[PDB]
Amino acid sequence: SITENTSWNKEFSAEAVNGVFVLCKSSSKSCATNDLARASKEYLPASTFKIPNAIIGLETGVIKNEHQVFKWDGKPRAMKQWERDLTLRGAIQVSAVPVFQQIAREVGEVRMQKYLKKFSYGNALEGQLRISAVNQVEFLESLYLNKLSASKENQLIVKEALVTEAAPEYLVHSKTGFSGVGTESNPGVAWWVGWVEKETEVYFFAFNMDIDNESKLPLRKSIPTKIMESEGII
Amino acid sequence: MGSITENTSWNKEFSAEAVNGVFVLCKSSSKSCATNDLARASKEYLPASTFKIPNAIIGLETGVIKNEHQVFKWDGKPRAMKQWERDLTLRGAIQVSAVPVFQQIAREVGEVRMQKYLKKFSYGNQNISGGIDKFALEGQLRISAVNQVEFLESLYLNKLSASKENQLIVKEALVTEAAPEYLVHSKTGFSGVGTESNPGVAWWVGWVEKETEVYFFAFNMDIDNESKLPLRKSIPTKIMESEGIIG
């Protein structure tokens, strides 16, 4: 059950942004959003696909365990932070695409296909697979509860890998995504998805927006944060 | 672990704050450690609230703690610290260091089961005198800085005598700082003021995952005054900053 909240439309209007935020307490059986229509509309997952990819990599034993080191082959890559040896968390945090391209190559298209169906994930950083903000939140819940078709052990490994902010009374698991600058008529998409544990409570969130100007990128974080802080979540 | 060397240039931070204590830093890839005082690095002290680490692992391995999603319900009755007067998760109870919660956990485990596990963990001098809720805080169990890093490294590598699953749960519950380049797991401890001429102890233990490297650490100091307590963290941080680990 998803319900519409117009009280935050001042932020989207002031920033000239077309996007959607979905935030749920306890269980994804009652969520809130700024745009009902967009909440269920499906966009390219971009780098948020690293989450299911990592689970599948470990399930198939392509990634041997949590302590796996992905050696850099020494060839130039697209960004500097990727030009080094990386751990699972390292590769997820700097978002090193070639590391995860290589994992998926070994997994094979047919195996990946199957597990995705199994996870109810969705319909690459540009392909044929798309996912909604409602879909993302339902998937992240299952991961938190250990409910995915995967060993409990492997879901825990990816759960720790996704930790982005830690405090004595709250913990944040999250991942950004960004498909690239687009046209006014063919815009890119930016993502931030995750969940917050606070007190004995748990909050699931997923945000996306169109992006035709690169400098509008920080708003994928500032807007969801303005909201979540106003709710007393962080 | 593998090797240890005395590095006396760390004593600067110690003399500055008038602190009588020790710091042990180990680098995982090369199995080697550095410390400012070889002798205190080997001396055994009360584990205090660092015992919550083995206590949490055993709590799970025996069914007493059901899983990672269990809530420890407050009865509405006043507790020794304001911080403790609420329902806590496993991470919650560990982060605010809620003594009565882990004492109840210890009670349910039992005398014989608690012994058997500390044996397999190689935890300290292995003794549980005074009562089944007294030994860690003010009893007869003792452990050294060197022993703490050995214990913590086993846990990191999932090598302790428990399920991988359970070792992972406690590992997440111990996360205290998170940046894009590094992640810190840690726990504090503090026995009390003791007396003048017979002080109490304060600990900081953990490990830092950073790049492909991992760094285990343990710190402890003599303490008789509560105002010195922040130093249990500010000194080890200083040492680790100048070595380019955190911050």
Ligand SMILES: *C(=O)[C@@H](NC(=O)Cc1ccccc1)[C@@H]1N[C@@H](C(=O)O)C(C)(C)S1
């Ligand atoms: C996931 O989207 C990844 N993005 C790309 O590889 C496309 C791209 C777009 C602009 C510049 C370079 C590459 C990685 N994840 C994002 C993100 O998390 O924001 C990066 C921009 C780090 S690349």
Ligand SMILES: *C(=O)[C@@H](NC(=O)Cc1ccccc1)[C@@H]1N[C@@H](C(=O)O)C(C)(C)S1
């Ligand atoms: C672990 O040592 C715990 N310490 C005690 O319960 C002993 C104590 C000392 C003074 C007053 C009351 C109880 C926990 N660790 C410390 C700490 O982290 O500062 C606490 C005082 C929070 S209890």
